[PDB]
Amino acid sequence: APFVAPNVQGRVIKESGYNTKTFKPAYVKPKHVIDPNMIIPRQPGEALGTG
C-alpha cells in the first residue's frame, strides 16, 4: 500500500478483468454390416466333421 504524507489526498489503484473459453464436442459413428458370408463359416471353438 502506498506511502502518503498525511497532508495530501491519496492514491487510486487499478483492477483486473475476466476471460472466457468455449468448447464444442465431436461426433463419432462407427458401424458394421453383417452378411451371410460372415455368419456361415466356422467359429473356432467347434468340432471337426459336423459343426
Binding site: 451371410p36 458370408n37 456361415i40 463359416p41
Partner: protein, 61 residues
Amino acid sequence: TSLPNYLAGNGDLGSWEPTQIFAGEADIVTEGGAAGADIEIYQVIAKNAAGAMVPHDPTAT
C-alpha cells in the same frame, strides 16, 4: 480362402483303394542309405558311381 459356396453340386469326398505290397512270405531286409535324386515311395532304386541311391533306369551309358 473364405467363401461359403451357396450352389448345388455333387462331389466326392475321396476314394480309398488299398495298396497291398507283399505277394509272398519271405523275410524282409532293410537299410537306410543316402539319396542322389528325388525318390517317390516304392520306386525301384539303383546306386550310381558315387554310392548314392538314384532311382532305377536301364539303358544308361
